[PDB]
Amino acid sequence: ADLEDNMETLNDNLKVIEKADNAAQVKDALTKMRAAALDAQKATPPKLEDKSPDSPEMWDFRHGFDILVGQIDDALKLANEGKVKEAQAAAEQLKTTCNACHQKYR
Numbered sequence: 001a002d003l004e005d006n007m008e009t010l011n012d013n014l015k016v017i018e019k020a021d022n023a024a025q026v027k028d029a030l031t032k033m034r035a036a037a038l039d040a041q042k043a044t045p046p047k048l049e050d051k052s053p054d055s056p057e058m059w060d061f062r063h064g065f066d067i068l069v070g071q072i073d074d075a076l077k078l079a080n081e082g083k084v085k086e087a088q089a090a091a092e093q094l095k096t097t098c099n100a101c102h103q104k105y106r
């Protein structure tokens with residue numbers, strides 16, 4: 001799907017994690033964020049449409065997602081350890097990554 005769709009998926013699932021009823025719901029949401037994040041990483045955002053694929057900007061753009069996926073995976077580990085609250089806390093920390101990217105490229 002396109003960048004926008006992927007972003008909506010991330011935002012939607014993040015709020016799901018915050019509402020987190022059970023471990024299952026947090027894991028499902030995190031898993032969907034993982035896929036959406038990796039999918040988004042392959043797109044070319046509007047602000048960089050005129051830039052080369054190998055440009056420093058694009059690599060920086062792609063880097064933002066490497067960080068997000070790492071954080072998501074770490075939250076996944078916590079969730080699969082049965083530590084649901086810590087995993088939700090970790091999901092909250094993710095926001096810093098979202099905001100950083102939006103500042104430069106949104």
Ligand code: HEC
Pocket residue numbers: 003004005006007008010011014045046061062063064065068094095097098099101102105106
């Ligand atoms: C860069 C590496 C990004 C990371 C990490 C995240 N987002 Fe993002 N987001 C990015 C761009 C360039 C844009 C503009 C997309 C466009 O062309 O319209 C966005 C936009 C959003 C939006 C609003 C627009 C929409 O999705 O329709 C939301 C709701 C959004 N992003 C949420 C979001 C969340 C929750 C993230 C972290 C968990 C996140 N984004 C990361 C680039 C990047």
